[PDB]
């Protein structure tokens, strides 16, 4: 009952290139990939659900919450008007899985984020997950024994799933809850992808590239000089076309001119992502900048443009020592959330000002913090 493939359902209109059989559960993750000795060598074992069947099982699993949420919004149990399900789509490699050679695994998973019902012309929410990021509500879709950087295998195994999700983007799901047929329609948002996997699935270059952002076309130099005025530009379609431009070189340009034309898209995308930021990384990036500012204000680097490596090192040592004495901060060499949390305080700025001669610069550091 709790596994995909048990309840019956319908898609209207029927999903493109997806079987209508509803009794399908665990199916081979290779999706019929050829395995003969002539063909490309298949080094991987994977198993998956059909993405629609899994959505069906996850909704039936949460039926009780959906009905009770309808009650809690002063609505009727039997209403069936179009429910809209928002679905966070997610993907990560899981490092070494081996029991003891490294054995790597990729997990493609989803999370029901919110379910709203339409009453008149107000969209009233009937359910939303309290812990979106928990391991507990991250519904597994496919597990595979492969490297997230093994592009050929990854596309081979994930592409059927994406095909299914594309299919669901333009169809309604009819599903029986509590005796009454209910109708669902979905919004899929691939927000669960760390930067490396975003870049890999959207055709972009590796992280060291000059095109540092997956939301815009900035270069590292542009983004550094131009501090704040940047806007979200990129989209999956724009990336598929920038790939085709790379591929076709329509204006017969050189490789550097072509690379500037397509702003990093040298490979063909195959997943639409919603690249976001982690609150952790905001804190970490800010703290790293403030740490450098502190040590440079102690060394007074404006007065010493040709300062050597060892003088700056002693500046860093000075700051470390004084932060240990005043704030009890063990100097570390790898930036982390807890260091950032303890360093980004106004009192820490007072502590570091105790080592800065000019008070005019105390003004500036304190306002910055």
């Amino acid at each position: 009952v709790l596994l995909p493939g048990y309840h019956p359902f319908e898609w209207q209109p029927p999903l493109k290139n997806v079987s209508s059989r509803t009794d399908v559960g665990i199916i081979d993750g290779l999706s019929g990939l050829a395995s003969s000795v002539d063909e490309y060598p298949v080094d991987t074992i994977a198993k998956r659900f059909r993405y629609d069947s899994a959505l069906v099982s996850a909704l039936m699993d949460m039926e009780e919450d959906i009905l009770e949420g309808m009650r809690s919004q002063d609505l009727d149990d039997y209403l069936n008007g179009p429910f809209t399900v928002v679905v966070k789509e997610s993907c990560d490699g899981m490092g070494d899985v081996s029991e003891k050679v490294p054995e790597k695994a990729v997990r493609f998973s989803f999370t029901v984020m919110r379910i709203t019902i339409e009453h008149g012309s107000q969209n009233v929410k009937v359910f939303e997950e309290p812990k979106p990021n928990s391991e507990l509500c991250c519904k597994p879709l496919c597990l595979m024994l492969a490297d997230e950087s093994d592009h050929e295998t990854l596309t081979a195994i994930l592409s059927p799933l994406i095909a299914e999700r594309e299919a669901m983007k333009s169809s309604e799901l009819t599903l029986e809850m509590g005796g009454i047929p209910r109708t669902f329609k979905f919004i899929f948002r691939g927000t669960g992808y760390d930067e490396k996997l975003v870049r890999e699935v959207e055709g972009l270059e590796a992280s060291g590239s000059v095109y540092i952002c997956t939301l815009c076309d900035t270069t590292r130099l542009e983004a550094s000089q131009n501090l704040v005025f940047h806007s979200i530009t990129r989209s999956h379609a724009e990336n598929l076309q920038r790939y085709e431009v790379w591929r076709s070189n329509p204006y017969h340009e050189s490789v550097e001119e072509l690379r500037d034309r397509v702003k990093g898209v040298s490979a063909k995308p195959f997943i639409e992502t919603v690249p976001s930021i982690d609150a952790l990384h905001c804190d970490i990036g800010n703290a790293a900048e403030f740490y450098k500012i502190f040590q440079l204000e102690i060394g007074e680097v404006y007065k010493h443009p040709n300062a050597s490596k060892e003088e700056r090192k002693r500046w860093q040592a000075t700051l470390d020592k004084h932060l240990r004495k005043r704030m009890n901060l063990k100097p570390i060499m790898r930036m982390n959330g807890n260091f950032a949390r303890k360093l980004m305080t106004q009192e820490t700025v007072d502590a570091v000002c105790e080592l800065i001669p000019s008070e005019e610069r105390h003004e500036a550091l304190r306002e910055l913090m």
Partner: protein
């Protein structure tokens, strides 16, 4: 025929089954790297240099008027006399099958830059495929391309996500292809009943011989040999095929040219569980067995082997690593 082990540089990972080697003026080049091309080599085409049994892959650049074709696994390739290379079909790093045709030539050689131009195709374009053959025939002072065989995904109507990667042999139609203008004509022949992929192809004058291969539907590696004659009058060409006894049974074999007008093929897969350890000699048509080379035990006990023709009557082959390097490579020489 002497076997020689080869060591490889830092980018050995680029080599994968389905790769190709092309020979331009004695210089060897490598195409079909694993993964999409990286900043270190944006074209994905490499100078393939074996010095002192050491293989170095050095980045090659494309001209300003070039396509940046994707790496392709199992495309049909042939050589066309400027001297150029024909690429048709293949698998991309995203597992899509390409129906396009790319043409490779040496644009400039400083101390090489390539011209890669894609040729558009109209008429009876063959469905995108891999594991198929393409060669050039010459009849009455005219040149034409012959394409035959291979496998592809199911058609869009029957293809289903549960069997999204399932493949079937292409219909065994012969395709004449004019590379200058990009036109294609399909010829159904009664003698070619079944589909065929991973076969060997030999082109001489107005004839193409088809050897071995694997037929998916029957799952048989047929021991038939097919001769294909093509005449090019001023009107529509005429193609006639005839079955010839004495056909070898082998899929994914490698073919190289020794001296002039003598070809040697080194093994492929004879059965799903068995490997073709023997080698065959084709004189232009008669096939004679040759003395099997001095294979090492690693080659003998490997389940999978893959390779390509280097051009100089020498084969470059590779075998998978032990469970505890990813690949181990050898060079097998002839003549």
């Amino acid at each position: 025929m002497s076997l020689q082990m080869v060591t490889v540089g830092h980018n050995i990972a680029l080599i994968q089954p389905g790769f190709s080697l092309m020979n331009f003026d004695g210089q060897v080049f490598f195409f079909g790297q694993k993964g999409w091309p990286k900043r270190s080599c944006p074209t994905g085409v490499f100078h393939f240099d074996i010095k002192q049994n050491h293989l170095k892959l050095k980045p090659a650049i494309f001209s300003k008027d070039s396509c940046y074709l994707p790496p392709l696994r199992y495309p049909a390739t042939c050589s066309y006399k400027k001297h150029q290379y024909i690429i048709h079909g293949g698998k991309t790093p995203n597992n899509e099958l390409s129906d396009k045709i790319y043409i490779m030539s040496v644009a400039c050689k400083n101390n090489v830059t390539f011209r890669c131009t894609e040729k558009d195709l109209v008429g009876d374009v063959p469905e995108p495929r891999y594991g198929h053959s393409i060669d050039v025939v010459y009849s009455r002072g005219k040149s034409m391309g012959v394409l035959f065989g291979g496998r592809s995904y199911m058609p869009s109507t029957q293809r289903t996500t549960e069997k999204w990667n399932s493949v079937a042999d292409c219909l065994p139609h012969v395709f004449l292809i004019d590379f200058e203008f990009g036109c294609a004509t399909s010829y159904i022949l009664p003698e070619l009943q079944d589909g065929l992929s991973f076969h060997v192809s030999i082109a001489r004058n107005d004839t193409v011989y088809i050897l071995g291969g694997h037929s998916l539907a029957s799952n048989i590696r047929p021991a038939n040999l097919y001769r294909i004659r093509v005449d090019l009058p001023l009107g529509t060409p005429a193609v006639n095929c005839t079955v010839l006894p004495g056909g070898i049974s082998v899929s994914s074999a490698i073919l190289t040219q020794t001296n002039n007008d003598e070809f040697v093929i080194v093994g492929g897969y004879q059965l799903e569980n068995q490997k073709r350890m023997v080698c065959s000699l084709v004189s232009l048509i008669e096939i004679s067995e040759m003395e099997t080379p001095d294979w090492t035990s690693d080659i003998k006990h490997s389940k999978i082997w893959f390779g390509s023709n280097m051009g100089n009557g020498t084969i470059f082959l590779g075998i998978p690593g032990d469970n505890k390097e990813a690949f181990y490579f050898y060079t097998l020489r002839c003549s």
